[model samples]
Target: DKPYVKTESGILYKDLIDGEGDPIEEGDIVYIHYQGKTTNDFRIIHSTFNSIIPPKIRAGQYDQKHIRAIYEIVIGMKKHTRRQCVVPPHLAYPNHFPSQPLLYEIDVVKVVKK
Candidate 1:
């Protein structure tokens, strides 16, 4: 099945290739490779796939909705996940950001059990 995550911005591409471990619970450290761009021209403004630690978010600690979505991901699952989320202005930064869509390619590398 195709793994698609719908966010306020757009849709994110995701895939669970291996493992059937417990579904993503709170407190799991998720490793992800991502690129943020404007949907208007598809200009990449930020990407963090080469960083030593990359960006780590403690599921359920960040954005309420975003964290909820992260919790949906399971642990021990492996594969290349990708998606483009159309973040609504309200869901995202509404005041100073231009109106555009966003895309993301994420990999739930390790979901450390809390």
Candidate 2:
């Protein structure tokens, strides 16, 4: 099993699959399939697996975004990589008063540099 690693910001993550090509960078357009759930109870909060189109995000935009953990975690990822993250309440939803940590399974479908 891949060991879970911690970031300076306090999130925990582990890579499930290796990706190819250049790593993601600032301003890149990223398409992703993800599932966000509660840590203990495992209740799914958000997902894009069944959507016809995956979610598209612009890298380096975490400052203004609501989901800081997801944005930060995806910054250095590569195309077709899969990762799992444990996001604390403070970083998961900085603007709200959420108490529980979030668990995320993310797949980087594509990455396009601008």
Candidate 3:
């Protein structure tokens, strides 16, 4: 089995590598390269790779959908931070749009002007 670190809430995570820069702030625009999938089959529902640029969004904005878990971890992350977060069903909100606990491989590429 793959090794991972379990959080207090049963959320598992593995930091492929640490990023540079400071932690992200709320309302700050964040750019992240990400791949979202279901834990059961690892089916990728979405990704921001292969694009001209990584996806960008304001921190704490839940309106974007499926970005919650990633954002949850991002607010405290620095630029270039690459990590895989496994948010369990208990921590994942149904309204967030995932059928089950979601796995996200995320790279905090940049923190745009706050």
Q: Tell me the deviation in Å of residue 38 in model 1.
A: 1.3
Please give, for residues 2-112, the per-residue lDDT of candidate 3 as tens digits.
478776656678777778777788878888888878777779878779889777888866665544566566666788878788877655656654467888888888798
TM-score of 2: 0.87
- Cα lDDT, all candidates: 0.50, 0.83, 0.74
- Listed per model in order, the count of residue pairs whose N, CA or C atoms clash below 3 Å is 16, 0, 0
Model 3 TM-score, 2 decimals: 0.73
lDDT of 1 by residue, 23-104 (tens): 5555666656565566677787667777887556665455453423333332324423343344444444455444754543
- Give the Å shift of residue 94 in candidate 2: 5.4
Q: Tens digits of per-residue lDDT for model 2 on 4-93?
A: 899998899998887888988888888889988887788888888898998888876775543777777887789988989989888876
Candidate 3 Cα errors over 4 Å, as ranges: 1-11, 90-99
Q: What is the lDDT of residue 17 in candidate 1?
A: 47
